[PDB]
Design a binder for this molecule. Structure first.
Ligand code: HEM
Lengths: 139, 144, 88
């Protein structure tokens, strides 16, 4: 990371603002179309198209990323509690975090094309790359 | 050169490499960073540390504002009832932390204060933030 | 066209920076999924620079055609490099 990258991440995520929960659910849905191996159902979760849990999960992904951006100077500590989550360890395959974070860039750049320059794109790519490795550090 | 004019160049001064800024009696006060339409000023919310330390003196309380990614921050003017306050650098944590600590005096019973500021990454596009309201959890009061 | 020519040069340079910053740690993504990721990047660069390029409709279209081809020359070695890493 760097001062330029950190500044790009705040500006990009700042312009997202209240629509972060919507893109979090959208990025999760985009992952299944682009990567069909990722799409797998499990008993205690609702993965329908207009699901309440998928929308609820989008807010949880948004609030986690919002916390990560708020404490971007020490990201590992901010996401240490989330990295021990049992739901992820049991249900989610380690690779899918890199695939979801990739699809979030595709979602964010789609909804915010003007502010998303190649410099900002690479800044969020590096930022979202580190968040994937932090959450998959435990397994 | 000044803290108000350009934080980019204000932190170039090596005298404030890791200078002390934690001496004397202080107070923890939370705040909220809003914008023109009373919405959350997100970039500032991420940038400024909440709560802020309010250090006491013999005349007026000095509010310390910890601003991260100081290498990209340029303009940072603070006003009290549309009156510009004397902002200055008291310390600065260098890269990779890049936190800039600035202080400014505030009169008794003060809570709301606007911030006219901007940011710039090296020689690039300057992003202006013409209005950002800062509201503390309580009105600031200096001890005797 | 000069304006478009210089804008392609910056686009290729900015794209090369994106490829260089990639870390190949575990858990690694598959060859099929990495091809999709590269296409998503190239499409983003096409989307952005399509707004930046100027001139006549055919001059902008020919500029974006050269950009898409120029990006593939940087992408194909990256995908081939990743295949040699993945097999080991
Ligand atoms: C990097 C992107 C992701 C982030 C930031 C994220 C974040 C979160 C958070 C904060 C929670 C709530 C944990 C708590 O209670 O504190 C959660 C729960 C959960 N997540 Fe994720 N997640 C991500 C990706 C995924 C993926 C790809 C899947 C796979 C489908 C997934 C499946 C789940 C499940 C099944 C739960 C349990 C929710 C419940 O029933 O309480 N997550 N996630």
């Amino acid at each position: 990371l760097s001062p330029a990258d950190k500044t790009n991440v705040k500006a990009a995520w700042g312009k997202v603002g209240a629509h972060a929960g919507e893109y979090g659910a959208e990025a999760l849905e985009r992952m299944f179309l682009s990567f069909p191996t990722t799409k797998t159902y499990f008993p205690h979760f609702d993965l329908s198209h207009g699901s309440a849990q998928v929308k609820g999960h989008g807010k949880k992904v948004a609030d986690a990323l919002t916390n990560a951006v708020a404490h971007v100077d020490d990201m590992p500590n901010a996401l240490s509690a989330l990295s021990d989550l049992h739901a992820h360890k049991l249900r989610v395959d380690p690779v899918n975090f890199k695939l979801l974070s990739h699809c979030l860039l595709v979602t964010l750049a789609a909804h915010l094309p003007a502010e998303f320059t190649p410099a900002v794109h690479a800044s969020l790519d590096k930022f979202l790359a580190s968040v994937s490795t932090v959450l998959t550090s435990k397994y | 050169h000044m803290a108000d004019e350009s934080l980019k160049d204000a932190i170039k001064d090596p005298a404030l490499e890791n200078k002390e800024h934690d001496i004397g009696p202080r107070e923890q006060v939370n705040f909220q960073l809003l914008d023109k339409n009373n919405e959350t000023q997100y970039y500032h919310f991420f940038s400024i540390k909440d709560p802020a330390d309010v250090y006491y003196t013999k005349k007026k309380a000095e509010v310390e504002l910890d601003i991260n990614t100081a290498s990209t921050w340029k303009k940072f003017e603070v006003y009290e009832n549309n009156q510009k306050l004397p902002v200055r650098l008291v310390s600065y944590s260098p890269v990779p932390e890049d936190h800039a600590y600035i202080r400014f005096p505030v009169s008794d019973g003060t809570q709301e204060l606007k911030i006219v500021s901007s940011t710039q990454i090296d020689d690039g596009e300057e992003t202006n933030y013409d209005y950002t309201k800062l509201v503390f959890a309580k009105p600031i009061y200096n001890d005797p | 066209l000069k304006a478009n020519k210089d804008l392609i040069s910056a686009g290729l340079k900015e794209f090369s920076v994106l490829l260089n910053q990639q870390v190949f740690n575990d858990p690694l993504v598959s060859e099929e999924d990495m091809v999709t990721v590269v296409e998503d990047w190239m499409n983003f660069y096409i989307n952005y620079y399509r707004q930046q390029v100027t001139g006549e409709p055919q001059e902008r279209d020919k500029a974006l055609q050269e950009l898409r081809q120029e990006l593939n020359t940087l992408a194909n070695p990256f995908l081939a490099k990743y295949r040699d890493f993945l097999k080991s």
